[PDB]
Amino acid sequence: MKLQTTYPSNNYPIYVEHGAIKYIGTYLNQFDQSFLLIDEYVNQYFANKFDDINVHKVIIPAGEKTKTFEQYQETLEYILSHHVTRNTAIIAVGGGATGDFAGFVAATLLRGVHFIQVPTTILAHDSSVGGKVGINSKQGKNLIGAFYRPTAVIYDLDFLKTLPFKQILSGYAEVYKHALLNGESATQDIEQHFKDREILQSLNGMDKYIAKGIETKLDIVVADEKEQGVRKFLNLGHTFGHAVEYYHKIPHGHAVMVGIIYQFIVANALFDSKHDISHYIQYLIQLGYPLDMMLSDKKNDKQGVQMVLMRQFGDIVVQHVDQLTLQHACEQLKTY
Ligand SMILES: NC(=O)c1ccc[n+]([C@@H]2O[C@H](COP(=O)([O-])OP(=O)(O)OC[C@H]3O[C@@H](n4cnc5c(N)ncnc54)[C@H](O)[C@@H]3O)[C@@H](O)[C@H]2O)c1
Ligand SMILES: O=C(O)[C@]1(O)C[C@H](CP(=O)(O)O)[C@@H](O)[C@H](O)C1
Ligand SMILES: [Zn+2]
């Protein structure tokens, strides 16, 4: 299984399969040099699997810790003291935090070097695609960054077999977000597969759902690349997610999910949609999600918050929302 971009020119591949880590050599030795940027923890996890392969490993901080200015500068400089060249490659081995970061590096190093994505998490089935590199600020989630099409995406599904539930739940939220953006057909289909923590935690049939969630996006991104129209949809529930996250430091997905319900709550308070909140709540409980726990966003336009609201499957929209509505929802949600 392989997917590829559809843009007019400068298109990259997305090898999605078990053992795709093999596809990596086929490029590597066609570069002057190559820097391996890898998660501190992830490096532990698979340090050996890479020995099997003009290559300098660069171990970076674990997760979100790596996405800071401080860390961007330090790295670059290091990578610079190697009299590098435009034909050099940056290889992101890890979660979206590793890619988002490394990529930014690869996007700026000498105005643009080669970028290779070796996503290792479930959530990375979204982060590895689109080329939305960038880092964090003291003002929020990724305010500094860029769009930089990766040279290619190597998604070796074997990486996943070692993900704590905490990270499985995190990532799935995206696989699920994508299902949601495919109308009912995919939503209630996926719901009927991963209907409980047991089945989920087992990773059984995740191959199927990830592959689609990606393709789903693959179409949106290949279309509205610079997020001018539809790419704005992918920000489903992040309006509230991105917030609750950077403000509760829970795993990305956890906040997304939450925000994803919030969105619905607000859909009802606006278009009086027939959203069965209680249904989505039991879904998160049955799935095993925790369940005990905004003015600066990217879709925002000077006037107030802009949310990606679903009025019904196959009918997503974006628009302002008075803090008024944002209350009853973030209060109706408090009744849980
Ligand atoms: N389009 C985009 O650029 C985009 C899309 C989605 C989300 N994101 C970004 O993605 C990040 C969230 O993704 P994430 O969950 O992958 O982040 P992450 O890098 O923090 O990974 C989660 C944790 O799991 C560890 N880990 C990674 N691979 C593992 C594996 N295979 N087995 C076990 N442990 C592993 C990491 O060390 C980390 O502690 C955020 O920084 C978010 O802003 C960006
Ligand atoms: O266009 C995308 O790929 C996203 O909207 C990009 C966002 C990141 P942003 O809102 O910081 O651009 C990501 O969290 C979301 O899951 C998908
Ligand atoms: Zn996200």
From Swiss-Prot:
NCBIfam families according to UniProt: aroB
Molecular function, one GO term: 3-dehydroquinate synthase activity
Subcellular location: Cytoplasm
InterPro entries: Dehydroquinate_synthase, DHQ_synth_AroB, DHQ_synth_fam, DHQS/DOIS_N, DHQS_C
Sorted UniProt keywords: Amino-acid biosynthesis, Aromatic amino acid biosynthesis, Cobalt, Cytoplasm, Lyase, Metal-binding, NAD, Nucleotide-binding, Zinc
Involved pathway(s): Metabolic intermediate biosynthesis; chorismate biosynthesis; chorismate from D-erythrose 4-phosphate and phosphoenolpyruvate: step 2/7
E.C. number: 4.2.3.4
Cofactor: NAD(+); Co(2+); Zn(2+)
Name of the protein in its database record: 3-dehydroquinate synthase
Pfam families in the cross-refs: DHQ_synthase, DHQS_C
Cofactor note: Binds 1 divalent metal cation per subunit. Can use either Co(2+) or Zn(2+).
Binding site for Zn(2+): 174, 238, 252
Reactions listed under catalytic activity: 7-phospho-2-dehydro-3-deoxy-D-arabino-heptonate = 3-dehydroquinate + phosphate
Family the entry assigns: Belongs to the sugar phosphate cyclases superfamily. Dehydroquinate synthase family.
A cellular-component GO term for this protein: cytoplasm
Main EC class the enzyme belongs to: lyase
